[PDB]
Design a binder for this molecule. Sequence first.
Ligand code: 5M5
Ligand code: 5M5
Ligand code: PLP
Ligand code: PLP
Ligand code: CL
Ligand code: CL
Lengths: 409, 411
Amino acid sequence: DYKTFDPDLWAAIAKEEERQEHNLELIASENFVSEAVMAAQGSILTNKYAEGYPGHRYYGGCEFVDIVENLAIDRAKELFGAKFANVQPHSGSQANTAAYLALVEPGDTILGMDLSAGGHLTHGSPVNFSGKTYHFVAYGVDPTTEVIDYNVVRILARKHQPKLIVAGASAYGRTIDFAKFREIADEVGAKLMVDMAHIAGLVAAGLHPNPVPYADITTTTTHKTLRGPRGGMILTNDEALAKKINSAVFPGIQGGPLEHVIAGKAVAFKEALDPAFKEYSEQIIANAKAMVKVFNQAIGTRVISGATDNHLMLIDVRELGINGKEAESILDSVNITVNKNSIPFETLSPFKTSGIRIGTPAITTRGFKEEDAVKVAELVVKALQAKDDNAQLDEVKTGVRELTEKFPL
Amino acid sequence: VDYKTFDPDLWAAIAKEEERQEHNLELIASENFVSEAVMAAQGSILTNKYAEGYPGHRYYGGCEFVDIVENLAIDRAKELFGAKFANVQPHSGSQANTAAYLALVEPGDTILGMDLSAGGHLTHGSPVNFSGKTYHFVAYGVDPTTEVIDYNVVRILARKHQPKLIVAGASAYGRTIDFAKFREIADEVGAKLMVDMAHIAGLVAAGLHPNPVPYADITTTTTHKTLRGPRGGMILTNDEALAKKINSAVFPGIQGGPLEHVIAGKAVAFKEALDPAFKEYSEQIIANAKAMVKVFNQAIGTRVISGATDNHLMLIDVRELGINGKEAESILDSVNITVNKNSIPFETLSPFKTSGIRIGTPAITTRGFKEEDAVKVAELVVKALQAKDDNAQLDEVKTGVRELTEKFPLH
Ligand SMILES: Cc1n[nH]c2c1[C@](c1cc(CO)cc(-c3ccccc3)c1)(C(C)C)C(C#N)=C(N)O2
Ligand SMILES: Cc1n[nH]c2c1[C@](c1cc(CO)cc(-c3ccccc3)c1)(C(C)C)C(C#N)=C(N)O2
Ligand SMILES: *Cc1c(COP(=O)(O)O)cnc(C)c1O
Ligand SMILES: *Cc1c(COP(=O)(O)O)cnc(C)c1O
Ligand SMILES: [Cl-]
Ligand SMILES: [Cl-]
């Protein structure tokens, strides 16, 4: 009825719910938040200014908003064991912005994972505030094993004497050894910052080593594997760091927080304290390993590093005579969403790439099991092997429809 | 109701905040009540979509309809304010301003912006904010007698310090801002001009405040406040080269994925602001503020800074009542009237005590208050502040508050 006033807006939203229903979301950073999370984001909390922190706001009327933000703060400490949590970052990028501000000065040397090797843009890219503001040295993965070579990272750290070492990745499918990063950091006198955005839910479920005890500062998104609303968060065990972090977030780089989103963080965090979330996360990894099995055995789909320990995988497609962007386009046409993705030692443009990235958190949320995940990888290989063959691509589309009807939203 | 059962801690708190918004006089100058449609947009399944990039140039597929939504927001913004280019991805006014600075100046450049005590925002050069830390800000303020911007002083400062950029816009300034005179001072010294219209964006959209968009190299704004949209930011320009620097600065410059469900709420709100009724709304805002200023001007104890308002807000020196801004704020809070303490020009107290309070009418106007009601509000505020904890008087104010909120219930 309010939709009558703005028919064009609500029509697009309606077609988007239809799109999420009928497509397979394999983009590794996506998920489906719960009805309760969306309800919190749709609440009247959007009306409340609340600059400052609970009990220390810059105007009145925050007595009950402070309950919401405290729940989000306190559930983060419960989920991750940190002594201090900040839940105001508007995004993972802002969380990283403020975490740098608390650890280093502009121009300081920072060691962070190369983007082609699987790092995020905020870990040093020159088109990002991180590369522009600080002096980033990249570490990568080994060219044969495509896993992190900690002795090489150690060579780099001693050569470059960074003030800060950053661990964490957006397209790295293997366990990150946080304890080795800490030893390296200690040895050259650098601090350690971990960006666990992609794996935060696996960490919360106890299925990936927890960086919080090792890192000076841990940043994360609240979406992705955590299955929360879009937003960021900052954790630390050092009270002196927590103070810098808090000043960095506000009044440093942000103004008022999105308390309706923070309310959705609180909702999501309690969902993640439930034992059901560990079963969900167990299924994320098992579905990913099952799909990796299919690709390892298929022809043309080289899994980077040959296995996965977490929710995602990188597929090198150069042996199908295509690039990532063509692979992304083929699969999009049969109603399968992935993203083109640079692979270690990428030779092509970052906008063509030599591979695609695939993650299980979204389909696992829809209820897919290993059987169904195996099926998707088979559909993916069939589509990419079918050199522009409409008969075969329609088959794949049929298989995608079967799956989406089997697991509606 | 079922998800509410899984988390009573969370939802009982939100239930309390609903009651509080319904039972309070919200006089915080930057707050409002967004429509049901806006809230419905922020609560949609659009929170699930990653859409890094811009419409037609995302970094992956599946953005067909997210592009309609964001293009609606962009196009409606171009139409509301008459700018050739609009970026609707900033997560906030602070992000909007962060990206605008990156498109205009280099770290360390000299920038002229309004002093915090005088009414400027934190992002206009405060040393505790990225703006003060990253650039060499030189502040202008207001004249101590008239408490309005002295444009000859801006000229004097601009010529002395040769800023690369001049920033106009304010958070606690109740008078018309002469953008033409800023444009002429910038041109004289060869500086760029940035205008931050967050507070007055809705008045500007209604034609009730001079439009900065033709004068400013870049205009930034929030989408909440007088525009009455979701919390968020926006960047406007007419210059195509700046538009590209702006879009690069926002992504991948300082943000990752945008909040597409908030951007949907921006599109909803921009269409509401294009409706002819929004102009009647915005005119009621100003008439209510002027009605309140008249009352405060007649009560001793409540000195209105500069003695008049042209917009939605007023700044009140309370010191002759023997209290500071913090005490006034909490006095008013105890009788269900919510303001914020606020520094006044040439502030003598701590920035966390302050000499004043800031009051605005956008929120009460949104729930239907007229000039008659705006008058009763200011009278209730005067009564509460003069009551010297006389509980009988404070309880009378609570009744007056209850009368107004029951007379104008919320949606
Ligand atoms: C958007 C983003 N932010 N951080 C990322 C991305 C990814 C990405 C994808 C693409 C696809 O054309 C381009 C870029 C890119 C980065 C710098 C300059 C030009 C283009 C980056 C993925 C995770 C979305 C990506 C890859 N590849 C990984 N490694 O990190
Ligand atoms: C939060 C904010 N951001 N931008 C603003 C604010 C205001 C504000 C209020 C307060 C109230 O204790 C303190 C400060 C402050 C900030 C940093 C250092 C010292 C003091 C600022 C208002 C509009 C909320 C303010 C005032 N006064 C105006 N002028 O601009
Ligand atoms: C996704 C991601 C980010 C950025 O989060 P945004 O909300 O898009 O700004 C930062 N770091 C890592 C490791 C990420 O995976
Ligand atoms: C409120 C305001 C801002 C900050 O907007 P946020 O969303 O809180 O970051 C910036 N400039 C002005 C003039 C403002 O009034
Ligand atoms: Cl990502
Ligand atoms: Cl403000």
